[PDB]
Amino acid sequence: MLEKFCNSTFWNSSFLDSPEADLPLCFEQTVLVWIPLGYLWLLAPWQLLHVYKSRTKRSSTTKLYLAKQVFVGFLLILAAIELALVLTETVPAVRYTNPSLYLGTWLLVLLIQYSRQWCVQKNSWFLSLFWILSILCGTFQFQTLIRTLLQGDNSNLAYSCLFFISYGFQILILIFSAFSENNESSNNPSSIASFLSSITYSWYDSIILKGYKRPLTLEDVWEVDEEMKTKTLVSKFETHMKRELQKARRALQSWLMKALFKTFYMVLLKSFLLKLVNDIFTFVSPQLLKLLISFASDRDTYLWIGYLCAILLFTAALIQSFCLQCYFQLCFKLGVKVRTAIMASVYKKALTLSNLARKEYTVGETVNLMSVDAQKLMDVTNFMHMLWSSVLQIVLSIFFLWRELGPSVLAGVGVMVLVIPINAILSTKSKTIQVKNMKNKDKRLKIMNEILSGIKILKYFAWEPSFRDQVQNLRKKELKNLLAFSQLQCVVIFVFQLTPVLVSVVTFSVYVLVDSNNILDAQKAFTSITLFNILRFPLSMLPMMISSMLQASVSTERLEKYLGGDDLDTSAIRHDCNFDKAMQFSEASFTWEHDSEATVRDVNLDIMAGQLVAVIGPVGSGKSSLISAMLGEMENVHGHITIKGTTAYVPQQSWIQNGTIKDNILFGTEFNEKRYQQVLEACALLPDLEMLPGGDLAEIGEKGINLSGGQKQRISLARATYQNLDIYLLDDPLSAVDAHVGKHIFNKVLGPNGLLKGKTRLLVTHSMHFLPQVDEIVVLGNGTIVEKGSYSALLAKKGEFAKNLKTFLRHTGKFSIYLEYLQAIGLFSIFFIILAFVMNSVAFIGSNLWLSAWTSDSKIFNSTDYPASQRDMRVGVYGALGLAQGIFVFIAHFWSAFGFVHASNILHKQLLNNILRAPMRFFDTTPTGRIVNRFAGDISTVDDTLPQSLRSWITCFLGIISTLVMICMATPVFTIIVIPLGIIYVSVQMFYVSTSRQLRRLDSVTRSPIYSHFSETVSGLPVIRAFEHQQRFLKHNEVRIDTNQKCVFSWITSNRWLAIRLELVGNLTVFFSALMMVIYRDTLSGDTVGFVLSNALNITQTLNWLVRMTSEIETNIVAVERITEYTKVENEAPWVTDKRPPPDWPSKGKIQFNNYQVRYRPELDLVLRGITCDIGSMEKIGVVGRTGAGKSSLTNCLFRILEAAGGQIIIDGVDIASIGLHDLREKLTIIPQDPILFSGSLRMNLDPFNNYSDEEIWKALELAHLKSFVASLQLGLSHEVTEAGGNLSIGQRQLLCLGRALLRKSKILVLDEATAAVDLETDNLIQTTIQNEFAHCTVITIAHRLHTIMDSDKVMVLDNGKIIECGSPEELLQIPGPFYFMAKEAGI
Ligand SMILES: C=CC1=C(C)/C(=C\c2[nH]c(Cc3[nH]c(/C=C4\NC(=O)C(C)=C4C=C)c(C)c3CCC(=O)NCCS(=O)(=O)O)c(CCC(=O)NCCS(=O)(=O)O)c2C)NC1=O
């Protein structure tokens, strides 16, 4: 075809037959120079016009640009000399043509390198992929010329000496091409990096070298680009969301996935051509060791075939680690981009949803549209390409298997398919025992809150074991659903790890039995064993996949129902800037529901600007409905409302955001010190701020849990007053505040002399005191304005207002942590679940090492001389090594389950049995948030997530030490290569683990603020739309998502810089081993090559999962650090001591204090400073003093809650310090200031130990006056108590506590303000019962009510930790001491 073109033979096929093969020199200069040049010249126009359009300011010429230009200049000089030496010196066309095309091209390249100067990415994929294409194409000529020269045929040294230097530049320009850091454009180097630095993710080394030294912060992670930010995603999505939704409503007389495929169809198609290439390049290696096995079988083949399959087996496995990791970033970027156009598009819809179509949603569930329905669409697009990629890796891996083992392989496939039913029935039954366990996961935590919230009371009585066994007995019913759950995940893996071992036994055992003439070779047994690994995963995830898109089809149905909802109608409310009146009602009627009668009927009302107006009426008259209509919340039946100026709104239920007091009051407005202080004093908030430790900066909890109801209302009012709007709408703002405060607020804020004098004010109030100062009063009756007028006018009319007014008036006259878990499992049980794993790695090396000794038969016997006597010891002994792994992978996976739900049983058990024995100081110091997390989020990992991670590390680590024992026993010289690779792998261990942990703990840290914020804007939505501040919240939810993307996307590309360096170590091992099966081809059998290479081909998958399961064992093993720090905290004195007192002790109830001293903490000053007193038998004593004088402190000393710093306490002649704590506590009784009641039945709260009969309990209740109330209950003593007794009145709880005291009948009783929060009638009942029933017991009373103490035999005055006076009440009253002054101040 081209013979005359070169004048030499073109493609003499015999050139590729001799032991010294070489391509014809004409072919190299005829087809290996047009592939590269053809690639460029055919494609330069696209990459030159495309850059002119996207023009940018020229960058400063850096050194690398000039150098890249000089060298391309040389290729012009060297491409011109070549032509010169031809014209100057009969030559063929090829001798002067190809030289010219270099000059023509090198100019074009010299220009394209100049054009990139006006682009962000200097070294694009175009010219950085033409050097590769011209170095792997111009290297077949760097050998033909060099081989020719070495034979003394230096008759072409002119053309050769040029090519040997021109080719030395293409491999030097490429090196300069990879480097691209020539600016700081883009805060992230992701967009300035070159091609060879964007496919290997080598621009990510800066983050890793930064997080390895320090702890990463949100600033060390660069922001995402502009094409990925939220304000841009919600822009592209919007134009498609509405169009499909628009036509979706057309057919009404499913739209979300049409508006999500259209928005991203340049990433579904861009990453569809990389999963398709990855599938083409995944069956190359399985079909490329079929030659290294045949090659090693024969010692006659040529060496050049040996090294050409050891290079294409490393160059075709290097392109598949880039076409893949460059595909995993296109799929994992479309997930964080499909949950950001749905997160940021649900928020934007929360602010414009008709409240008629919002009451059907609950704030607890509308928030879940961002937490489970928008993250179930993030996890479906991450692997949405396995719908066709797992049907193409199956249709192919079954075809390539068929070509080798024929129809017999259907038996092999028939086994894997029969695992799909087992992988879908043990996954369903796994969810059942998981969700079924959520009941005991929650109700277990519910109780723990009660124990911690009220531990002080729990320690007063001997109720510790009562509650210690309540949780323990409540946990055994959870482990049984855990031990039975860890056995359903160690059987779904055991059937996945043993799948390739069972198919290999069935397939061969049927190939060599179903028919004679079938003999195994190394080209059938070892190239099909590595074909059962390509088909293992695609065929063992379909049940898990198609059950995860059908689960995401019920979530897209929710968003499709929320986003495509109705919109609030504001047509009724008109806004006119020229309107004379501030507000006006023109026959306006509003109804909450279209099917419900209007709550506001034909209201005609006109309001002038600046007027203070009050609306009054009976409860349920529609007052709150009127204010709702003003905001546009209520639906219009007929009429309209005209409004002029901005509107402020104060809800009856005050809505407080999460943040500081200063933040809520400002509400996004600039801070003005002068105005801000004026509002606080006007709002009477200064006293409130002073009490708070942080003042105006004090952080507000969820829904103002730290603030009182009256407080919240003032803050809500302060917010409106500060904002300074034209119209004010108030909904009973003074109901929750005191009368005097209301007067101050009204006079300084709402009244004619207040701050809002010049602004229109509407005040819906139930208080009739402010009406005389109101400009106009409106009376609402049955949804209609019954009467309207000024205060004096209404009184004269003698209407309903006067009638109601008269009615109102008539009523007014590290490795330690890794051991603590490991020891808990039982070191004995750890020897048998690591010996049974290593014995599986010894039946694996034996199972394949036996197959290499089986395929050797083909080289000895044949189809004729292969007896059944010898053909059965092979298929038999292989069927015994195929179940010798099935009784060590099953004996090591069950015994592991029993060892991981027993270490959890003995970690919670110790923790719960230690904090319950901790000194009171420990509980007060640490917040309840911590102690309740060591049972919520920590014991929830030691149970479920840590067991599954330590099991996949032992099975992985032994999966690589076994594969390094096969690769090494064949060629021992390979051992010296592992050391260079081990350092590379160990160095990647340190860098990835250090930085991957810090980035997925910066993901959860800022994953909730998206949701926590979403609760605020949806619960307090009506307030936001009132101020028109619904546009500073979109920008506040497009900034709480952009702060997550920067942390989620910075972790997605941290498993890419890894997967490319661990698929370059397990891929550099299938090379440095396949390249020693050719050097030593004279000693290695054909069988041994498959025995070694068929394993090394899957050392890249196993190396990744040993470095990712080494990262979860470092992020989850933190849990065991906290569960152990608390378990080893200091404890109180032993509950029971050898020196038990007599059973009747105490007999007289005498108490003696001897210079007693106590301090709350070692670092805090003494609370009591030498207390010395004697209390006689049956002596009634009252304790009085100023707050903080140590009154309540004395009680703690009696119960030994606070250990003595000095002195001693003796009861009935025995020092309490020598007695066990419980023995002392069971014989003392205290009625607490706060009557805390735990959840459960009344019987349990009264007698948790169940040591008493119902009759005694009923008798105690009768003495407590609670018999009637308890009898009235349907369940009686079995009546359930809510948390903290929220269903019982404060007096009822206190009476119930009295029931506890009357039951115990202790000789010593202590009353600590038992009647501070008790009404007089119940207080007298308590006193009467105490006086009668406890007349024969020593009673010590602490009370702020002196009259309750005048009956005491003696009264002690405590001040600053010292007893000043001690005597009878009469004697003290005669002496003008502190007691006299307090009694005088009390009116006595
Ligand atoms: C857990 C949710 C879930 C997922 C994520 C899922 C699909 C799915 N699951 C996995 C991971 C996976 N799981 C298993 C075993 C199981 N699969 C189960 O459903 C169960 C219960 C088990 C437990 C035995 C294996 C063996 C692998 C890795 C497989 C592999 O090596 N792939 C190479 C690339 S290729 O094959 O795709 O070409 C992948 C591969 C993605 C990957 O390579 N790494 C994860 C992302 S990244 O780290 O790189 O950033 C995919 C597409 N199906 C599901 O139900």
Ligand SMILES: CC(C)CCC[C@@H](C)[C@H]1CC[C@H]2[C@@H]3CC=C4C[C@@H](O)CC[C@]4(C)[C@H]3CC[C@]12C
């Ligand atoms: C979302 C959660 C529940 C799933 C993630 C857990 C994954 C990463 C775990 C679960 C089971 C694990 C596999 C268990 C056993 C083997 C066989 C071994 O020779 C290679 C690794 C491999 C294939 C493990 C890789 C990691 C693995 C796939």
